[PDB]
Design a protein around this ligand. Structure first.
Ligand SMILES: Nc1ncnc2c1ncn2[C@@H]1O[C@H](COP(=O)(O)OP(=O)(O)O)[C@@H](O)[C@H]1O
Ligand SMILES: [K+]
Ligand SMILES: [Mg+2]
Length: 780
């Protein structure tokens, strides 16, 4: 009665966009989450709910509550680029009927529109923290109205999860310096034990629920028997048609689900098991339906299965060999070895029902929202080690489709030996959230950085302000070291002290580090290395420049050293000079092949990182030399997933080093670097830099249009559409040495986009020419 959406004083225009697919009434917990306290007035809120319970609607009503009531700008923060991109389009579609402009600041991407001409900016953690820093230097902190944090449990421990605290703490420190509404915080996560601590730290009202529209049946199978969390038998399983192999009834379980016209997610430890399992299942699906690499069977969807394989074909990766076998039978795999474009296709196919069986890794469990009737976990041993509890809850959470299934079933297959360990996961619970700013060592990276941001930014100047900040931390909410970090910044010339007793100021090295979004620990080695490059620099190739923008803070692949030594001998003299100039000794490469001795316990054995870095720069060199992804894979021995993940990392890092050089006055160095951020992003040469401004144009399409007479956007705006269409048809990779009168493919949507409607080769060509024209006019 009262939770009817029409009784909340909702604008009429918006109320219908929600009703497009469901959403006429809310939930018991969503109405209570809004009404209790002074939350709807602007008070901060930290709420928890089970996965697939409707956490999105609660935040959205609060965001619209501020954008339209306070006429201020909102900030939506998401962990990954893939989940951030998924959220942007979902929010764009909802917030357009009232003239509300919504874009995003994600990974290497940047908005065409000014921050002043937005309403809601969608960011990742790294990019959001930088944007906040943008607002401090310009004192435009007054623009920001609220921040929404998704996955609040990443506050605890992550490669970047600590940035979430510095971000929030900075907001808590600033809002304290003005101490009617100020800055509202809406955080949400899974059930945390110390969740009450987070609500108190942020002075937020709390809400927690266990509600879930579809009941989840977590279970564990040992042999034929299936038990619940209390080891009580709930089903004695017997396989309808036996097949050979390992067979812990894995194929029979998948078959049972499909026959009831449903879909199943099958999680496997390694990337190789997923492909092997997708192959076995798809192979058995061929024999069993008929009782004894094709076209999809004739149903209502014959057209869409064909559209999917063709979209895969017209990609920079091509159509995977294993997928060509499996996809025709609604079977596929999904891991980090695949490119981000392949994974966007499969996730969409599975979400539409085109793919009924999806054998995935742990990458998907933390990825986008993707539900299924039955979830199967192959083993409690992932990567040779027992499975993490959070990963388990993320896998089994995808069981049960709201509005479709009566229940969601989860099966964890085990042996008698790993029997005890499996039950531990079903009964297990999440660990308490750590501060990631902790003291053995008096100093720590996260703390040094937090202090640098507030001093250089100019919101903490004196010594009293520092301890005022210490009160606002999540670390102090749980109930010196700060003074140690300040001295560290003094010793390394990051900060200044003047004689009005004891006031701290930023140096040029300080102001440069902040604007570059670089870590103070990393800045020291970078600053010395750059000065080293400017004393003796090679300009005949782009290798030495690439080395300066080649990131080595994390391993992106397992390098085969014997292959490396083989490429070393074949390496031209111009690139050997660059190798020597960097630190690459041939003796060390030999000592890598002969014995797999990593050593690296000693700190001066950063010698290892150097050879790893030079190996990586070679890969980046071919990448911006427009070498096919398939050649690079065979040449170096790394998958297309690792390469693409690397270039998006190097594109970002290249921008940092460029800014770092600009703030230090190093013009000559800046001048050389300022061309590789764009080239690393798309993986192109200098000529294609202009073409790739068009959204639909990537490296391959840009090359074939360049080789056909269209060099610029200007050349592309006067262009004849049907000619562009023909040129596009020529860039496609076919298995036979390719490149029936079918008047039925005049409508086949075989071209993929972002936030996509299926595009035909004709519409894509017409969109490219239309977009080229729109850009050319804005240039005058
Ligand atoms: N109050 C609601 N009433 C009906 N359906 C909802 C409601 N909130 C969300 N949904 C739908 O349920 C699905 C899952 O909810 P979601 O908000 O994704 O939960 P979570 O964010 O915890 O995964 C979404 O696709 C959404 O369209
Ligand atoms: K593009
Ligand atoms: Mg969520």
């Amino acid at each position: 009665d009262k939770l009817l959406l029409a009784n909340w004083g909702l604008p009429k225009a918006v109320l219908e966009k929600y009703h497009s697919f469901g959403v006429k009434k809310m939930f018991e917990w969503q109405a209570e989450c809004l009404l209790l306290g002074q939350v709807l007035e602007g008070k901060n809120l930290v709420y928890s709910a089970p996965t697939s319970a409707g956490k999105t609607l609660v935040a959205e009503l609060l965001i619209l509550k501020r954008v339209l009531e306070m006429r201020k700008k909102a900030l939506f923060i998401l962990p990954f680029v893939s989940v951030a991109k998924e959220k942007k389009y979902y929010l764009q579609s909802l917030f357009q009927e009232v003239g509300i402009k919504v874009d995003g600041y994600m990974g290497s991407t940047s908005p065409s529109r000014h921050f002043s001409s937005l309403d809601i900016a969608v960011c990742t953690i790294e990019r959001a923290n930088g944007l906040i820093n943008r607002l401090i230097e310009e004192n435009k902190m007054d623009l920001l109205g609220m921040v929404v944090v998704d996955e609040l449990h990443m506050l605890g421990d992550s490669h970047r999860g600590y940035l979430l605290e510095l971000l929030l703490t900075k907001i808590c420190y600033i809002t304290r310096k003005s101490a009617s509404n100020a800055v509202q915080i809406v955080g949400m996560s899974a059930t945390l034990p110390n969740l009450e601590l987070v609500a108190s730290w942020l002075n937020a009202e709390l809400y927690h629920t266990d509600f879930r529209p579809v009941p989840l049946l977590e279970s564990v199978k040992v042999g034929n028997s299936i038990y619940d969390s209390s080891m009580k038998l709930v089903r004695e399983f017997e396989p309808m048609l036996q097949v050979k192999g390992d067979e812990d009834h894995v194929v029979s379980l998948c078959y049972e689900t499909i026959c009831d016209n449903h879909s199943v997610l099958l999680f496997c430890p390694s990337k190789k098991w997923c492909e092997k399992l997708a192959d076995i299942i798809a192979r058995e699906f061929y024999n069993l339906h008929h009782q004894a690499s094709e076209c999809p069977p004739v149903i209502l969807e014959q057209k869409e299965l064909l559209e999917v394989m063709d979209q895969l074909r017209r990609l920079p990766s091509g159509l995977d060999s294993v997928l060509q076998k499996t996809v025709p039978w609604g079977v596929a795999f999904h891991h980090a070895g695949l490119t981000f474009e392949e994974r966007d296709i499969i996730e969409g196919a599975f979400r539409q029902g085109l793919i009924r069986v999806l054998a995935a890794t742990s990458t998907l469990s933390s990825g986008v929202n993707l539900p299924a009737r039955r979830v199967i976990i192959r083993t409690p041993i992932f990567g040779g080690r027992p499975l993490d509890i959070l990963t388990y809850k993320q896998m089994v959470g995808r069981a049960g489709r709201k509005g479709v299934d009566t229940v969601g079933e989860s099966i964890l297959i085990c042996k008698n030996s790993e029997k005890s360990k499996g039950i531990a996961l079903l009964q297990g619970s999440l660990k308490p959230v750590r501060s990631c700013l902790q003291r053995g060592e008096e100093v720590t990276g996260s703390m040094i950085r937090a202090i640098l941001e507030i001093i250089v930014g100019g919101v903490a100047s004196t010594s009293q302000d520092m301890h005022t900040y210490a009160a606002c931390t999540f670390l102090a909410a749980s109930m010196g070291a700060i003074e140690a970090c300040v001295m560290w910044l003094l010793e390394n010339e990051f900060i200044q002290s003047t004689e009005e007793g004891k006031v701290y100021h930023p140096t040029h090295l300080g102001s440069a580090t902040l604007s570059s979004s670089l870590s103070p620990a990393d800045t020291l080695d970078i600053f010395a290395d750059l000065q080293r490059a400017m004393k003796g620099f090679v300009l005949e190739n782009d290798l030495h420049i690439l080395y300066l923008v080649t990131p080595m803070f994390e391993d992106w692949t397992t390098i085969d050293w014997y292959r490396f030594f083989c490429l070393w001998e074949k390496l031209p003299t111009s690139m050997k000079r660059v190798a020597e100039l960097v630190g690459v000794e041939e003796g060390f490469l030999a000592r890598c092949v002969k014995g797999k001795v990593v050593a690296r316990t000693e700190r001066q054995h950063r010698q290892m990182a150097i050879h790893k870095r030079f190996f990586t720069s070679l890969v980046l060199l071919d990448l911006i030399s427009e070498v096919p992804l398939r050649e690079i894979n065979q040449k170096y021995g790394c998958n297309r997933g690792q390469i693409q993940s690397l270039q998006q990392s190097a594109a970002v890092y290249a921008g940092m080093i460029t800014v770092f050089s600009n703030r230090l006055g190093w013009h000559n160095m800046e001048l050389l670097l300022s061309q590789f951020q764009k080239r690393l992003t798309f993986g192109i040469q200098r000529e294609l830099c202009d073409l790739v401004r068009v959204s639909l144009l990537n490296a391959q399409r840009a090359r074939v249009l360049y080789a056909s007479g269209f060099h610029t956007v200007a050349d592309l705006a006067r262009a004849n559409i049907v000619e562009v269409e023909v040129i596009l048809k020529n860039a496609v990779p076919f298995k036979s040495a390719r490149k029936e009168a079918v008047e039925e493919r005049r409508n086949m949507r075989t071209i993929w986009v972002t936030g996509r409607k299926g595009l035909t080769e004709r519409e894509a060509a017409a969109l490219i020419v239309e977009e080229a024209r729109m850009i050319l006019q804005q240039d005058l």
